[PDB]
């Protein structure tokens, strides 16, 4: 794991905490710019190209049948195999939380045009949230989406302007989501007692592992790991969750894929005053510490850091400053 500084083009200001990076056919794209889209880039989605440690953001265009989604901070994102991306939740530039679901796919590639289609949700729709996890599970030749955790504002009932922006953890219900038709089912589990946000999620077959996170009510980053198994029979699917010992305690960690059935996670925040400098390796599950990479002094003494997974087993990181300072850790 070798760390490398990155310079950025004229529009470096676009990059903000809670942004997202997505990988389509090796090509990386960027979503969640700061502020509302400008006449230079109406979509707010950018070809994210790093050449010779220099980052250029180039505007991407949407297709004619596309929705023009607002840029979203801390959405729940996952990959679906045509190859596409699922975006649910998140914060808008106006500080509003979205409960809608958007689907991103490559519509045309000329020397890329995107299709962004919003999927309506009926049934047990999840309350609008940010900082939650969403993944796709496959059980008996059927595909189903699993969504857990996060935060939102107080309900319209108890919301008072004096604490207008006050947030709380969602109810720790698991949400199964059928993407073709837009239907949503909510499951209460006995093993999931507390709310959880900013956690890490790993999806293999009919299973999703939930790691770390931050529980706002207790203000603890619990050191627990949850396995969630999903069965998709002809009838209502069945969900079982089990507590697993050996869980790391980390919020806002980033996850990347180094090889099939093996993931590495670079740090997040370990305490309010502490940072997680160490790195972990997960094999599909066993969690083993790895050698900490060569952090520079600036990263070590920064109180805040943020980042996203580029896809090619390489993390793109940022520290506060110049506006922000960026690194690539491979």
């Amino acid at each position: 794991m070798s760390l490398q500084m990155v310079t950025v083009g004229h529009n470096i200001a676009l990059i903000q905490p809670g942004f997202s990076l997505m990988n389509f056919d090796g090509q990386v794209f960027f979503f969640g710019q700061k502020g509302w889209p400008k006449r230079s880039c109406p979509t707010g989605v950018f070809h994210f190209d790093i050449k010779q440690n220099h980052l250029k953001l180039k505007p991407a265009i949407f297709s004619k049948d596309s929705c023009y989604l607002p840029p979203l901070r801390y959405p729940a994102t996952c990959s679906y195999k045509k190859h596409q991306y699922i975006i649910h939740g998140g914060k808008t530039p106006n500080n509003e939380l979205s409960d809608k679901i958007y689907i991103m796919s490559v519509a045309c590639k000329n020397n890329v045009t995107f299709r962004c289609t919003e999927k309506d949700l009926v049934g047990d729709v999840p309350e609008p949230r940010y900082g939650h996890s969403i993944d796709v599970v496959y059980s008996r030749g059927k595909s189903m989406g699993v969504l857990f955790g996060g935060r939102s504002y107080m309900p319209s009932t108890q919301r008072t302007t004096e604490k207008w922006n006050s947030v709380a953890d969602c109810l720790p219900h698991v949400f199964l989501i059928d993407f073709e038709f837009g239907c949503a089912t909510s499951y209460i589990l006995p093993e999931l007692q507390d709310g959880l946000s900013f956690h890490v999620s790993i999806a293999r077959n009919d299973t999703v592992y939930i790691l770390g996170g931050h529980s706002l009510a207790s203000n603890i980053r619990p050191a627990n790991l949850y396995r969630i198994r999903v069965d998709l029979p002809l009838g209502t699917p069945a969900v079982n969750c089990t507590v697993l010992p050996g869980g790391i305690s980390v919020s806002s960690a980033i996850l990347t894929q180094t090889n099939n059935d093996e993931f590495v996670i670079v740090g997040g925040y370990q305490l309010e005053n502490q940072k997680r400098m160490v790195c972990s390796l997960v094999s599909l599950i066993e969690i083993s510490e790895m050698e900490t990479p060569d952090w520079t002094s600036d990263i070590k003494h920064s109180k805040i850091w943020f980042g996203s997974n580029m896809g090619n087993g390489t993390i793109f990181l940022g520290i506060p400053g110049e506006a922000f300072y960026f690194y690539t850790l491979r």
Partner: peptide
């Protein structure tokens, strides 16, 4: 609607309870 009825209220925090955890937006 959505306003507390207390009348002894003076200067209050302008962030209006905005989340300040390191996880959240800075």
């Amino acid at each position: 609607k959505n306003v507390s009825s207390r009348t002894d209220v003076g200067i209050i925090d302008g962030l209006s309870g905005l989340a300040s955890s390191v996880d959240e937006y800075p």
